[PDB]
Amino acid sequence: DREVRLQLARKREVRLLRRQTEVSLLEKYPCSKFIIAIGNNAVAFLSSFVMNSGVWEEVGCAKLWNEWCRAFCVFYHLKSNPSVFLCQCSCYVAEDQQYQWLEKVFGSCPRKNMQITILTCRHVTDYKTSESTGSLPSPFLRALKTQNFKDSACCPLLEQPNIVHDLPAAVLSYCQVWKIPAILYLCYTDVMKLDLITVEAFKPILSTRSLKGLVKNIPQSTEILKKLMTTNEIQSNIYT
Amino acid sequence: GSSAGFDRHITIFSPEGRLYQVEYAFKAINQGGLTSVAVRGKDCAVIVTQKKVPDKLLDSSTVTHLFKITENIGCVMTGMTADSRSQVQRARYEAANWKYKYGYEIPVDMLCKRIADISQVYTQNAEMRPLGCCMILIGIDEEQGPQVYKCDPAGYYCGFKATAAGVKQTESTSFLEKKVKKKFDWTFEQTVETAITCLSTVLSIDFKPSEIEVGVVTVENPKFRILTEAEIDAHLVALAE
Amino acid sequence: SRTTIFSPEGRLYQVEYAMEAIGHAGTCLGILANDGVLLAAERRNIHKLLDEVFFSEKIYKLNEDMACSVAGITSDANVLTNELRLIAQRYLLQYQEPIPCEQLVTALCDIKQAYTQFGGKRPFGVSLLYIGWDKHYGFQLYQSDPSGNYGGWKATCIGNNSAAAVSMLKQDYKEGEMTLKSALALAIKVLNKTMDVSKLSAEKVEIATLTRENGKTVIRVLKQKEVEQLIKKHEEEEA
Amino acid sequence: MFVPCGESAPDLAGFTLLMPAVSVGNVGQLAMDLIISTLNMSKIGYFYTDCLVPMVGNNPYATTEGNSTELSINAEVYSLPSRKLVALQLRSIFIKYKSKPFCEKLLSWVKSSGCARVIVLSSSHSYQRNDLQLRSTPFRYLLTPSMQKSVQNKIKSLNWEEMEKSRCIPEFCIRIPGGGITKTLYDESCSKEIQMAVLLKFVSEGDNIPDALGLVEYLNEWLQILKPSRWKIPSSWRLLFGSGLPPALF
Amino acid sequence: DVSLHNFSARLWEQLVHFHVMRLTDSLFLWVGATPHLRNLAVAMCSRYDSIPVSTSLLGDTSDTTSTGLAQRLARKTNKQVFVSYNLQNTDSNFALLVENRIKEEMEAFPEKF
Amino acid sequence: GTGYDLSASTFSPDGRVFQVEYAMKAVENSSTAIGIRCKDGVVFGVEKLVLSKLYEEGSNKRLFNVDRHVGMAVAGLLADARSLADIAREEASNFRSNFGYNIPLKHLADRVAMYVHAYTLYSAVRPFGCSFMLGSYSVNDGAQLYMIDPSGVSYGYWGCAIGKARQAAKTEIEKLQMKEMTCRDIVKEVAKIIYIVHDEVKDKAFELELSWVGELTNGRHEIVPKDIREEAEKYAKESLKE
Amino acid sequence: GYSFSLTTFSPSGKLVQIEYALAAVAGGAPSVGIKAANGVVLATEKKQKSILYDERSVHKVEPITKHIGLVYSGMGPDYRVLVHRARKLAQQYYLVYQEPIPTAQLVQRVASVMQEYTQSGGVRPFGVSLLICGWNEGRPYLFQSDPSGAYFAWKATAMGKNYVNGKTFLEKRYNEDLELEDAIHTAILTLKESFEGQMTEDNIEVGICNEAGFRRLTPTEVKDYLAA
Amino acid sequence: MFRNQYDNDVTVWSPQGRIHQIEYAMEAVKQGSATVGLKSKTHAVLVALKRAQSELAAHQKKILHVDNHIGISIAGLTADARLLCNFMRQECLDSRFVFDRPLPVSRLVSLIGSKTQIPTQRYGRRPYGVGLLIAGYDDMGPHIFQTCPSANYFDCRAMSIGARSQSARTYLERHMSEFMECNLNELVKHGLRALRETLPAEQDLTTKNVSIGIVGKDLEFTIYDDDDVSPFLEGLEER
Amino acid sequence: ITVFSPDGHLFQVEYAQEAVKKGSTAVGVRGRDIVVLGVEKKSVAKLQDERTVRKICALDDNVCMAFAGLTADARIVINRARVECQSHRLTVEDPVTVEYITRYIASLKQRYTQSNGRRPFGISALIVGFDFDGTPRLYQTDPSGTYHAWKANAIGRGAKSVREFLEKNYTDEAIETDDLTIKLVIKALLEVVQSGGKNIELAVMRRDQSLKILNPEEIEKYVAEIEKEKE
């Protein structure tokens, strides 16, 4: 009964496993630009563009488990200057484990200097709009800045009635509460699978200061790399 | 569905042993907005109801509440028009079945009994809802003469001599009982005037030949007839004098 | 709604609800004896104006060889005992040999479990004790559960349970070295123990003795002076 | 877990909190947001707890363009120091087995800060009592013994209907199935003897805007919030039931 | 040719009826007091499985009565056996009696299965 | 009426079934359709809101022909409209075959009303989301126009509208006097009303879909000739302008 | 429709549906029956609320195959349905066994119908309680079929309003055996004890049963008994 | 917020007069792969985009053959697609078998709509979640019919449905006049250009991910596989 | 019941698995010329005969089975299996094969777990016996309906622990003769429950014999010598 529930709680809870091989990541090394990539498309765009020049040494991975997705939560740092950090999180973090993930990443001793740039993709249906969802552009994107970000967003902000939940919202709430500059980019795309249109829509972000100097241009190298991950796991027979 | 609530599920009894869906069906009958009366005289049975026509584009002729099930049996309807028409059609089917099987005309008592059985079916099975309408049957019986029977969605079919149904049902019933206690001859003109004046005084409005519709069945002519506006106007003049 | 849905821990529901309903449904008792398996019940309320046209209340006769007592819902108990009689007569029509007790209780528990398995019906929440001599084995007593499986409880009590007293009275005589008189004495003692309100008073409890005399199962119900002396034995027990 | 918006950590000494509850639909939260918008209660802090699923969005009460571009976390608190009025605002669904920690944390917060009276707007199920809800008014109240006797006599003069005291396992313990959080929160407050009152309403799932209006009118009648067109609805009360008509459907 | 040997037997007490359609080897058997085609299963000897392969054509899948009877009859005879057991509950012992009932007829009338 | 608006077999405390009302208001969601019962015959007019140029002219047609004599103008969900059109076709054909002569409009009207009411009765099936105007003219029966509200009412109208602009359309129609004139002018009048009720700001564009049945077309429901439709549209545009 | 059972066991184990049905039965006109030595009577109150109501149309008593007779307290459409079902059962039994249906089996059949209607989904328990009559073997019968399906043999019992007071009155009045022509007097006095006014000839109905069977008698016949 | 209460079933009306389940079905078509349908005065070309994955894993046969003059392409659930294709084949075959006449496309679409309307009305069902682009050639001439997951259908000059089909719709709307007065090769090239604009900038029309079905004045509906699409790909400009 | 979990687990079958886990430990060994079953017992039976609580039964003479979980569904499945065995013996007139009845039970469980109108059986039938040619058998079905042949299986309370212990212990040297198989089964049961004695419900079936419910006196003496061997 209670013991079984306790065993499940451990199974669901996030466990931080170091990649270099109970101290939190930011507690171990401070960061200056921690980039969060949520979802397959976000991490794909990160790998294509940002993780093109530099060592990007693996520092940690927040392995976890949930009924939906067990993928990976590997964290990276440039290793040319460890000041800048990164995170490619593809595994879905459940609601009961998002705050555990936040504790593992930051804990209780933040630096209050990181420009937390969050990369995530949502579905068009989530976008609360006056008109029908079919009229919206397929890959359009939105941004959610915090109080002390002060850096102009490259895209229009979200409308009032629209909201965001789950892990990106968790990190943004943590940043807002502790006064950490940040911005949450929403790439509202009709296709949630790996499609290069979604990353093409993610492109405008590398132009702005957020994640600006990390990419060493080279569109040809990135564009060729984008075609690499276009090949993915075989889909089912549900849709044709 | 699994509607646990007593107020939104017919089958489940209320904690005080009441069927809230039946009460809400009665409230629907009230929501119909109209009122109807029926009086059993010593020579005939009457049914008087108001015909309020929204606007003028609607054809006044089409909108009606006086229906005939069997050529001798009349009816007046109160409640939602769709439910009223459905119950009228079911009563017509029952009358046809009775005529085909038994071979003679369906008595009013038995017709109301059958309709009450159907209402019991509706109010017992959770699948469907009680029909939001009250039907009053009138007709001439070879043994009891004029007969007035009111069937209701609950499944209550007791016969009446003078009865009413609608939004003003309570006041109409009070006035009708007051008239009944006098116990006069109850002639054709007398009973028709009683019904029409009951409706007029409960609604506190003056009646016009086109504002109301009247149907009557009499011993002399067992066939049910809906009085034309000319006869209603003549009766209104009779009340005036 | 979810009348046939497994619980997360495997505790099928509505059958614990049947269990509780049985628990707060009186106190039916039955003890097996070598001379003849015994049964007992709790005649709730005086019921002065009630007429005992039926054989007895909560003690329904199953043909000539078996009798049963119930401690659950009265309507469900009535329906299930009617089905019991129907099945027993069915087997009698099939073969001259009357239905063995085990087979009939198995059939009834199969009906109960089928209700517990196929949706569309609330489980039959009645717990039954069957007495009766059988050509196979001998005198037998079975404890039925409204959720299914029966038992071979030689001594049992449903409703207010309190099986400690019945065990202390049954194992007292080696559980097999008893007599009928000892069976009535122990049954009265345990009923008095369970009957916290005052004590068993004649018409407050109804018992039936099922013994085979001269090769014939006599199902005799004790009442009036028969129960009057039983509580007199309770007075004897008090001393 | 109160985190000030700035750095002054404004003290809530001698204040009255206005918390909503996760009731049938969103009656309590809707009413709380409605009164917040009407009274123009400025944000003062951020109650960051680990009990609600995180969510973010722009300022629900946009008003000015500058105020429109803000951030609204799952748990934020606004206050109006003019009337010594503070008000928490719940806008999130709860995580499993986390509501009671919220109760304890907020009870400690109110006890330490000095917020005297906590008003808990909520709503219970429509059927509620044994047909008594259909016969009597939906509105009720449930005030802890620690509530100031002045407020108690004010309520008595208002001639309201007290909680039905629904029968529960021992025998008549107040049960509020619709609110859920309301029962445990009330018990925690009673243990802490913190002045608070639960203002609920027997309603059912669906559109609950009229229920919110009724509840805010109840609160106005008690504490004269506005004036015992009327309430300025938030800009958040938009696109709350649909996302446009698909042209092909019709 | 198809010999339509229709017969009835007072199985237990209820006068359960029977139907036969010989065809050539695809025997068809129906069982039930009431004239209803509730269930139906076809079974015939299979060279790939010791138990003749059978599938519940139509009716409740949680019956495993028509299919079992079809398998046993297909093992007894050769080729297909379209069993259509249509008893409501009949517990399970009664089904054994019917299996006995049909068995006796096959001995009495081997041609009129 | 929260809690009582999820099933068509549940009565609200007030005493109304909310599913039927939601069906009527979903009918309101669609564009307005107008029918007129003049002395000569019955004239229909529907604001066929064009969605995209890709759809070929005539697609998503709203004016169905149940039979040679009986037509139909619909609103609300078009799928339910087509299903009801098929049902009415079947009923009319059945009567024409069994009895041998064309169905009186009243019989079709009350039969389809009974069918839709039956659908509204039960919790499993949902009420039809479409309201239609069964209109027809016969040399003996006369010009008849019946609207079938999803509730199941069969009311004979001299003129009525159904859709988003139903109220304004009804006001304009009652300003018009629909008695003792040829349909030749009724087509122009109904086009005029459709033009007034149309909202260009909200509805980007629309197509005039006019059909009529009467002595001019020998009691047959046929789409108005292109020339007459063009003349009516020109008159409506001239009236709307200034 | 709604095949899944709607009467569901409560966590504690009580069937609230049957309890509400019993409450509805209690909220009904008193109906008292006596199992006297020479017959069984079923005097019930056919209360005309207004002069408009005509008792000559509807009756609260209904004989079954002569010997049997029934009354009710609550609802009444349910009573009519149950009367129809019981009459159909009596016809089937008589035509298939070539003998009138004995009382106990009719009670069992109606109780089984009640149990099915409270057990099967898609339907509600009948909100009525039936008092059987009968002259089986030449003795009275006073089985009281509760809405659940529990029928108990009685000698003096009321079921409608103030049924507890009526039961106490019968206990303090009813003789061990009594006799016909006095059971009606006792029942009328019980109704008086549990009436809201005065009784006319047609304000109450008597279901006296004898060798012939359960007879409704006539308003004039009962009126004679009221004067005595 | 409120729509969550009125979208669980298909038989519930929202307070906004909407049935969200039909909207979700209408989005199920978008969940499928993109397809393009356009016609000329003499031909009806049906161009479909096969999933750009390893065709070894699954041969995505979007374009299906219904009759000698009717063929359809799948956008959405495969089970509903198969059921609808089988139904259409039954009706066409029955027409040609009994009346010995080709079934008109419009009649077939009307039957499809009538069949697909029933699930929307009935409880416990769901609308057929697939969008068909019916390219047929009856007596009247070429016909491209759009069948939405709702029973509503549209007679369309040029259409494209599926994922990211808005670009194809824009292209088709920009060149309707050319489509009307084009021959076989030019019309096929126009459809292929629409599909390419559906595809991202980097991806191009390969033989692996393109399938086309053409029905014409004297041409039966023929599905051209990867090897048979190269002739149209050749001569088509990359830009 | 008919819905899958996000990971692809039917809830009803997992709940039935939990119910089985709460059941007694049905332990069997596939010995040559001898098949031994063993089920943990809750003792008790202070006023109840052991006849009615016999978890190990005999489906005909050449098959005997034990279960772990709820006993009502176990009783009904046992009744159905024995009825099928008798029907086969009647019509086909051959001894029913262990494979045949095991597949029948597995199919029944599959049928009951598929339809949503009925819940799955909350037991796991461990079936043993000898075929026509005398080959020892050992099978174990599941609520899902997956029948699997085993060398020496153990399912019930702490199924995994007893299973791995027996796998470590099970060897052809331990399967030789029949006393050794009895020792193996008793050792597994004692590993499950330390009390032993009455809790050890032991049943043995030989090649050409019927199911013999080994007497408690025989069970305890084997336990004593097993203890002696350990010392």
Side-chain angles (χ1 to χ4, degrees), chain C residues 16-45 47 49-50:
Chain C
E16 310 76 353
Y17 307 165
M19 285 335 93
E20 310 302 8
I22 300 311
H24 312 317
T27 320
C28 167
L29 173 69
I31 185 155
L32 209 158
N34 325 65
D35 311 278
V37 57
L38 170 69
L39 200 52
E42 171 161 289
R43 186 121 69 73
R44 166 210 47 77
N45 161 288
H47 270 306
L49 294 166
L50 190 85

Short mmCIF file of all heavy atoms in Angstrom, two decimals, chain C residues 16-50, unseen atoms left out:
data_model
loop_
_atom_site.label_atom_id
_atom_site.label_comp_id
_atom_site.label_asym_id
_atom_site.label_seq_id
_atom_site.Cartn_x
_atom_site.Cartn_y
_atom_site.Cartn_z
N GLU C 16 -17.45 -5.75 -1.00
CA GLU C 16 -17.30 -5.32 0.39
C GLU C 16 -18.54 -4.58 0.86
O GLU C 16 -18.90 -4.67 2.04
CB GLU C 16 -16.05 -4.44 0.59
CG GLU C 16 -14.75 -4.97 0.03
CD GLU C 16 -14.64 -4.84 -1.45
OE1 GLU C 16 -15.64 -4.45 -2.08
OE2 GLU C 16 -13.56 -5.14 -1.98
N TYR C 17 -19.20 -3.84 -0.03
CA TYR C 17 -20.45 -3.21 0.37
C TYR C 17 -21.50 -4.26 0.71
O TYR C 17 -22.23 -4.13 1.71
CB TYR C 17 -20.96 -2.27 -0.72
CG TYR C 17 -19.94 -1.25 -1.19
CD1 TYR C 17 -20.14 -0.54 -2.37
CD2 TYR C 17 -18.81 -0.95 -0.44
CE1 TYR C 17 -19.22 0.40 -2.80
CE2 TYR C 17 -17.89 -0.02 -0.86
CZ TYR C 17 -18.10 0.66 -2.04
OH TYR C 17 -17.19 1.60 -2.46
N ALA C 18 -21.58 -5.33 -0.08
CA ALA C 18 -22.44 -6.45 0.29
C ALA C 18 -22.01 -7.05 1.62
O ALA C 18 -22.86 -7.41 2.44
CB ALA C 18 -22.42 -7.51 -0.81
N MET C 19 -20.70 -7.19 1.85
CA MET C 19 -20.21 -7.70 3.13
C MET C 19 -20.73 -6.86 4.29
O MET C 19 -21.23 -7.40 5.29
CB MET C 19 -18.68 -7.72 3.14
CG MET C 19 -17.97 -8.81 2.34
SD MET C 19 -18.87 -10.34 2.02
CE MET C 19 -19.61 -9.99 0.43
N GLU C 20 -20.60 -5.54 4.20
CA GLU C 20 -21.07 -4.67 5.27
C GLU C 20 -22.58 -4.78 5.44
O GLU C 20 -23.08 -4.80 6.57
CB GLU C 20 -20.67 -3.21 5.00
CG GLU C 20 -19.20 -2.97 4.65
CD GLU C 20 -18.22 -3.46 5.70
OE1 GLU C 20 -18.65 -4.13 6.67
OE2 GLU C 20 -17.02 -3.15 5.57
N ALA C 21 -23.31 -4.84 4.33
CA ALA C 21 -24.76 -4.98 4.42
C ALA C 21 -25.14 -6.25 5.16
O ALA C 21 -26.04 -6.25 6.01
CB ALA C 21 -25.37 -4.97 3.02
N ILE C 22 -24.45 -7.36 4.87
CA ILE C 22 -24.66 -8.59 5.63
C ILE C 22 -24.32 -8.36 7.09
O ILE C 22 -25.04 -8.80 7.99
CB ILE C 22 -23.84 -9.74 5.03
CG1 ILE C 22 -24.23 -10.01 3.58
CG2 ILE C 22 -24.00 -11.00 5.87
CD1 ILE C 22 -25.71 -10.14 3.34
N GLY C 23 -23.20 -7.68 7.35
CA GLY C 23 -22.78 -7.48 8.73
C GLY C 23 -23.84 -6.79 9.56
O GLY C 23 -24.14 -7.22 10.68
N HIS C 24 -24.41 -5.72 9.03
CA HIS C 24 -25.52 -5.03 9.70
C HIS C 24 -26.86 -5.53 9.16
O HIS C 24 -27.69 -4.77 8.65
CB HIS C 24 -25.38 -3.52 9.54
CG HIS C 24 -24.01 -3.01 9.85
ND1 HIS C 24 -23.29 -3.44 10.94
CD2 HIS C 24 -23.23 -2.10 9.22
CE1 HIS C 24 -22.12 -2.82 10.96
NE2 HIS C 24 -22.06 -2.00 9.93
N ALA C 25 -27.07 -6.85 9.26
CA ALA C 25 -28.32 -7.46 8.81
C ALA C 25 -28.77 -8.57 9.74
O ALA C 25 -29.31 -9.59 9.28
CB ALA C 25 -28.17 -8.00 7.39
N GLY C 26 -28.57 -8.41 11.04
CA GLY C 26 -28.99 -9.39 12.02
C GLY C 26 -27.86 -10.30 12.45
O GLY C 26 -26.67 -9.95 12.40
N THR C 27 -28.23 -11.51 12.88
CA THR C 27 -27.28 -12.51 13.36
C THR C 27 -27.88 -13.89 13.10
O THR C 27 -28.71 -14.38 13.88
CB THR C 27 -26.96 -12.31 14.84
OG1 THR C 27 -26.84 -10.91 15.12
CG2 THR C 27 -25.67 -13.02 15.21
N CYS C 28 -27.46 -14.52 12.01
CA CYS C 28 -27.88 -15.88 11.69
C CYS C 28 -26.77 -16.85 12.08
O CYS C 28 -25.59 -16.59 11.86
CB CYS C 28 -28.20 -16.01 10.20
SG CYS C 28 -28.36 -17.71 9.63
N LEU C 29 -27.17 -17.98 12.66
CA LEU C 29 -26.25 -18.91 13.29
C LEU C 29 -26.56 -20.33 12.85
O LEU C 29 -27.70 -20.67 12.51
CB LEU C 29 -26.34 -18.81 14.82
CG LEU C 29 -25.55 -19.82 15.65
CD1 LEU C 29 -24.06 -19.59 15.52
CD2 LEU C 29 -25.99 -19.73 17.09
N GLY C 30 -25.52 -21.17 12.86
CA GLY C 30 -25.67 -22.57 12.51
C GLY C 30 -24.48 -23.40 12.93
O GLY C 30 -23.33 -23.02 12.66
N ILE C 31 -24.73 -24.53 13.58
CA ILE C 31 -23.67 -25.41 14.08
C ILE C 31 -23.99 -26.84 13.68
O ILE C 31 -25.14 -27.28 13.80
CB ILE C 31 -23.52 -25.30 15.61
CG1 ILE C 31 -22.32 -26.12 16.08
CG2 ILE C 31 -24.79 -25.76 16.31
CD1 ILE C 31 -21.72 -25.64 17.38
N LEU C 32 -22.98 -27.56 13.21
CA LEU C 32 -23.15 -28.95 12.80
C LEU C 32 -23.04 -29.87 14.00
O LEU C 32 -22.20 -29.68 14.88
CB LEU C 32 -22.10 -29.32 11.75
CG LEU C 32 -22.49 -30.41 10.75
CD1 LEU C 32 -21.64 -30.30 9.50
CD2 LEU C 32 -22.36 -31.80 11.36
N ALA C 33 -23.91 -30.88 14.04
CA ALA C 33 -23.91 -31.88 15.09
C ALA C 33 -24.02 -33.27 14.48
O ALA C 33 -24.55 -33.44 13.38
CB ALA C 33 -25.06 -31.66 16.08
N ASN C 34 -23.50 -34.27 15.20
CA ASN C 34 -23.50 -35.63 14.68
C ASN C 34 -24.92 -36.15 14.49
O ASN C 34 -25.23 -36.78 13.47
CB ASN C 34 -22.71 -36.55 15.60
CG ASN C 34 -21.53 -35.86 16.25
OD1 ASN C 34 -21.69 -34.94 17.04
ND2 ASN C 34 -20.33 -36.31 15.90
N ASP C 35 -25.80 -35.91 15.47
CA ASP C 35 -27.19 -36.34 15.32
C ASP C 35 -27.86 -35.63 14.15
O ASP C 35 -28.60 -36.24 13.38
CB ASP C 35 -27.96 -36.09 16.61
CG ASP C 35 -27.24 -36.63 17.83
OD1 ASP C 35 -27.36 -37.84 18.11
OD2 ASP C 35 -26.56 -35.84 18.52
N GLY C 36 -27.61 -34.33 14.01
CA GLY C 36 -28.18 -33.56 12.93
C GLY C 36 -27.69 -32.13 12.92
O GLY C 36 -27.65 -31.47 13.96
N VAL C 37 -27.30 -31.64 11.74
CA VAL C 37 -26.81 -30.27 11.62
C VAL C 37 -27.91 -29.31 12.06
O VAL C 37 -29.08 -29.46 11.70
CB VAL C 37 -26.35 -29.99 10.18
CG1 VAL C 37 -27.48 -30.23 9.20
CG2 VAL C 37 -25.81 -28.57 10.05
N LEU C 38 -27.52 -28.31 12.86
CA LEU C 38 -28.45 -27.37 13.46
C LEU C 38 -28.33 -26.01 12.79
O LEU C 38 -27.28 -25.65 12.24
CB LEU C 38 -28.19 -27.24 14.96
CG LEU C 38 -28.92 -26.13 15.72
CD1 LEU C 38 -30.40 -26.43 15.80
CD2 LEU C 38 -28.31 -25.97 17.10
N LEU C 39 -29.42 -25.24 12.85
CA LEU C 39 -29.45 -23.87 12.36
C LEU C 39 -30.12 -22.98 13.39
O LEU C 39 -30.87 -23.45 14.26
CB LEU C 39 -30.20 -23.79 11.02
CG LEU C 39 -29.95 -22.57 10.12
CD1 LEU C 39 -28.47 -22.35 9.87
CD2 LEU C 39 -30.68 -22.75 8.80
N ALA C 40 -29.84 -21.68 13.31
CA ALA C 40 -30.42 -20.72 14.23
C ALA C 40 -30.44 -19.35 13.55
O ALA C 40 -29.74 -19.12 12.57
CB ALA C 40 -29.66 -20.66 15.55
N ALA C 41 -31.25 -18.46 14.10
CA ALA C 41 -31.42 -17.13 13.52
C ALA C 41 -31.81 -16.17 14.64
O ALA C 41 -31.78 -16.52 15.83
CB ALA C 41 -32.46 -17.14 12.40
N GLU C 42 -32.17 -14.94 14.27
CA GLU C 42 -32.58 -13.90 15.20
C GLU C 42 -33.93 -13.36 14.73
O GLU C 42 -34.01 -12.65 13.73
CB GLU C 42 -31.54 -12.78 15.28
CG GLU C 42 -32.00 -11.56 16.06
CD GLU C 42 -30.84 -10.69 16.50
OE1 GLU C 42 -30.09 -11.12 17.41
OE2 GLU C 42 -30.68 -9.58 15.95
N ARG C 43 -34.99 -13.71 15.46
CA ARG C 43 -36.35 -13.28 15.12
C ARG C 43 -36.50 -11.83 15.55
O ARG C 43 -36.94 -11.52 16.66
CB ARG C 43 -37.38 -14.18 15.78
CG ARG C 43 -38.81 -13.91 15.37
CD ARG C 43 -39.45 -15.15 14.75
NE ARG C 43 -39.66 -16.21 15.72
CZ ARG C 43 -40.60 -16.20 16.66
NH1 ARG C 43 -41.43 -15.18 16.79
NH2 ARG C 43 -40.71 -17.24 17.48
N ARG C 44 -36.13 -10.92 14.65
CA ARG C 44 -36.11 -9.50 14.97
C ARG C 44 -37.53 -9.00 15.24
O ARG C 44 -38.46 -9.31 14.49
CB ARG C 44 -35.47 -8.72 13.83
CG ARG C 44 -35.67 -7.19 13.85
CD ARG C 44 -35.69 -6.59 12.45
NE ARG C 44 -36.53 -7.33 11.51
CZ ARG C 44 -37.85 -7.27 11.48
NH1 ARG C 44 -38.53 -6.50 12.31
NH2 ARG C 44 -38.51 -8.00 10.58
N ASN C 45 -37.68 -8.24 16.32
CA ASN C 45 -38.95 -7.60 16.68
C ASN C 45 -40.00 -8.64 17.04
O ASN C 45 -39.97 -9.77 16.55
CB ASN C 45 -39.44 -6.70 15.53
CG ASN C 45 -40.92 -6.40 15.62
OD1 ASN C 45 -41.76 -7.26 15.39
ND2 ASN C 45 -41.24 -5.16 15.97
N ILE C 46 -40.94 -8.26 17.91
CA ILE C 46 -41.99 -9.18 18.32
C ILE C 46 -42.89 -9.53 17.14
O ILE C 46 -43.21 -10.70 16.90
CB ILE C 46 -42.80 -8.59 19.49
N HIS C 47 -43.32 -8.51 16.38
CA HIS C 47 -44.24 -8.70 15.26
C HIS C 47 -45.52 -9.38 15.74
O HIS C 47 -45.88 -10.48 15.30
CB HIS C 47 -43.56 -9.50 14.14
CG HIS C 47 -42.85 -8.65 13.14
ND1 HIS C 47 -43.47 -7.61 12.47
CD2 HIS C 47 -41.58 -8.68 12.69
CE1 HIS C 47 -42.60 -7.04 11.65
NE2 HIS C 47 -41.45 -7.67 11.76
N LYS C 48 -46.22 -8.70 16.65
CA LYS C 48 -47.40 -9.29 17.28
C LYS C 48 -48.49 -9.57 16.25
O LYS C 48 -49.10 -10.65 16.26
CB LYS C 48 -47.92 -8.37 18.38
N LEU C 49 -48.76 -8.62 15.36
CA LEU C 49 -49.81 -8.79 14.37
C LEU C 49 -49.38 -9.64 13.19
O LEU C 49 -50.22 -9.99 12.36
CB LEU C 49 -50.28 -7.42 13.87
CG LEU C 49 -50.97 -6.55 14.92
CD1 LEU C 49 -51.08 -5.11 14.45
CD2 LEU C 49 -52.34 -7.12 15.25
N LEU C 50 -48.09 -9.97 13.08
CA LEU C 50 -47.63 -10.81 11.99
C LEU C 50 -48.16 -12.23 12.14
O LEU C 50 -48.19 -12.78 13.25
CB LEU C 50 -46.10 -10.83 11.95
CG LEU C 50 -45.46 -11.47 10.72
CD1 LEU C 50 -45.35 -10.46 9.59
CD2 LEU C 50 -44.10 -12.05 11.06
#
